[PDB]
Ligand binder design. Structure first.
Ligand SMILES: CC(F)(F)CN1Cc2cc(C(F)(F)F)ncc2-c2cnc(NCc3c(F)ccc4c3CCO4)n3cnc(c23)C1=O
Length: 359
């Protein structure tokens, strides 16, 4: 079980929209997590007796910047951790977490970036989702835009979230148009574009890097939720997604026995395997998270209550729920993050507060 061992508050007093533990931290090193809020990203180290040590922040030059998301990766030659952040300005910043120096930046999205995710098998492939209705896949080793996922049959409104499956062969995205869209990235076209992005060196060529424009998803559905879908994650071949209807739905494209890789773009069926209901969620922009092994699922509500579901059961609908409450924790929890070993759960709130729960 989890016990609340410490709380903290950031000086800006603005909501904290994101929190991510670094799952790429070396053995023996303390557990480190990043928070994003206001025009700032801050790093903290978790220590014994619930101590949370403040390290260093990156503060954006523009006081009007709002960071909405962050994600960790590592430098592909040195293994040193790297941190990517993005928000309202639509600029992806790659930060060296040691010195908090901005190493490089990527621009292209016509609007705010709602989420960043790194590929589970390739530390150089970064996915960004934006208010301009599109997803973008970048290669941060060669600084190239590999592909833009959107267009004529892509999202019709702001994209809120996206996730890669286990092998990083497909992406599921969701947003304000109420839809969930599947984009396969293991096609011959996408694997060739990724290979070409690695061979690109502008000092050694005259051509610009040609980005793929993917106008058609491999699956699309609006039958899961009746409002904006603001968070989606894969659970194997299954999908977990949530709207503002006080529920996380567990579902899969097609009929019960349909294989996810046999699903065609014209597939009109979905199968609901369960729904995890919870209380008091009226506001938009809340994220749920799973731990490294996907044994647990966590989500906070608008009054500081934490729900943790145990996914180590035969079928999704049998998930066991545990609730975590503290008399002082009363603001909306925007995101949670588990440490790689699942021994620590951090929750971040609307009042700039950070809450630590240890098993
Ligand atoms: C005038 C304005 F600043 F632009 C208003 N905001 C800022 C804002 C204000 C407030 C409040 F006032 F209540 F504190 N709440 C939410 C947002 C906000 C938050 N997070 C994203 N994106 C990331 C994102 C996501 F896409 C899906 C789930 C999710 C998150 C973060 C945590 O969970 N935002 C994108 N646009 C806004 C947000 C926005 O329009």
């Amino acid at each position: 079980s989890f016990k609340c061992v410490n709380s903290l508050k950031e000086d800006h007093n603005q909501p904290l929209f994101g929190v991510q533990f670094n799952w790429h931290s070396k053995e023996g090193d303390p557990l480190v997590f990043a928070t994003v809020g206001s025009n700032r990203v801050t790093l903290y180290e978790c220590h014994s007796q619930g101590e949370i040590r403040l390290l260093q922040s990156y503060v954006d030059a523009d006081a009007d910047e709002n960071f909405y998301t962050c994600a960790w990766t590592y430098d592909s030659n040195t293994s040193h951790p790297l941190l990517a952040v993005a928000g309202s300005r639509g600029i992806i910043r790659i930060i060296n977490p040691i010195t908090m120096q901005c190493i490089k930046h990527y621009v292209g999205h016509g609007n705010a970036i709602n989420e960043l995710k790194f590929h589970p098998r390739d530390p150089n492939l970064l996915l960004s989702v934006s208010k301009d209705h599109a997803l973008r896949l970048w290669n941060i080793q060669t600084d190239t835009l590999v592909a833009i996922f959107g267009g004529v049959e892509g999202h019709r409104d702001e994209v809120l979230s996206a996730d890669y499956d286990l092998l990083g062969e497909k992406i599921m995205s969701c947003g304000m148009d109420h839809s969930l869209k599947l984009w396969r990235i293991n096609s011959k076209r996408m694997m060739n574009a990724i290979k070409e992005s690695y061979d690109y060196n502008p000092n050694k060529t005259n051509r610009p890097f040609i980005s793929q424009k993917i106008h058609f998803p491999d699956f699309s559905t609006r039958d899961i939720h009746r409002n904006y879908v603001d968070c989606v994650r894969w659970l194997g071949d299954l999908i977990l997604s949530k709207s503002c209807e006080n529920a996380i739905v567990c579902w899969k494209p097609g009929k019960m026995e349909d294989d996810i890789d046999k699903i065609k773009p014209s597939e009109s069926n979905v199968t609901i395997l369960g729904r995890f209901d919870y209380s008091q969620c009226d506001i938009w922009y809340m994220r749920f998270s799973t731990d490294f092994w996907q044994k647990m699922l966590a989500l906070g509500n608008q009054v500081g209550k934490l729900y943790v579901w145990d996914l180590e059961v035969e079928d999704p609908h049998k998930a066991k729920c545990t609730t975590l409450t503290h008399h002082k924790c009363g603001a909306a929890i925007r995101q949670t993050s588990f440490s790689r070993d699942s021994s620590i759960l951090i929750a971040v709130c609307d009042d700039a507060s950070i809450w630590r729960w240890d098993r």
